[PDB]
Amino acid sequence: SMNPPPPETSNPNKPKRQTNQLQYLLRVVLKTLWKHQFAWPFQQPVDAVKLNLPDYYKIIKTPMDMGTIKKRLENNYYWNAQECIQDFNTMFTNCYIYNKPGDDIVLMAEALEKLFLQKINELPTEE
Ligand SMILES: Cc1cnc(Nc2ccc(N3CCN(C)CC3)cc2)nc1Nc1ccc(Cl)c(NS(=O)(=O)C(C)(C)C)c1
């Protein structure tokens, strides 16, 4: 009957940077996925109360979504590109853990993940 608080998106004491790689992760990677026709189920934390999935946050213990990633990038929350890439991978993996192969939600994640991988293949060299 309860959703957890969302993942952290603000922390003044956290070491953080703007790098050219992190800029690419916002301007290219996040922007490309966000505009996709299948983005919407991933644009905010899963509301497991509204979806009637009482097991969701009992099974998915490291939730992640693109709304959170977008805020983190906009706030320059990350230290490096790998931290942000990990958030995307957590989001995709969580989808495949929770759902059945071939479910619509899985097909949607797979389309986003394909694009993600194509974009990160061209992640620029740092600095
Ligand atoms: C990120 C994410 C990961 N996993 C799941 N899993 C999930 C599993 C079973 C359901 N239900 C269960 C019983 N219902 C009658 C059918 C769907 C919903 C979501 N959702 C996610 N987001 C999400 C957000 C908003 C909505 Cl409306 C949905 N619904 S949906 O998946 O059915 C679809 C997008 C295909 C319409 C999903």
H-helix or E-strand containing 61? Answer: none
**Ligand 1 pocket, residue 39 CB under 6 Å:** no
**Ligand 1 pocket, residue 92 CB under 6 Å:** no
The full DSSP string for 64-119 is --HHHHHHHHHTT--SSHHHHHHHHHHHHHHHHHHS-TT-HHHHHHHHHHHHHHHH
Taking CA atoms only, the protein residue closest to ligand 1 atom 19 is 51
Structural domain range at position 89 = 19-123
Give, as one character, the DSSP assignment of residue 27: I
Method: X-ray
Identify whether 70 is part of a domain.
yes
- 121, 24 Cβ separation under 8 angstroms: no
Identify whether 5 is part of a domain.
no
Q: Which residues contact 53 (CB under 8 A, 6 or more apart)?
A: 46
Identify whether 3 is part of a domain.
no
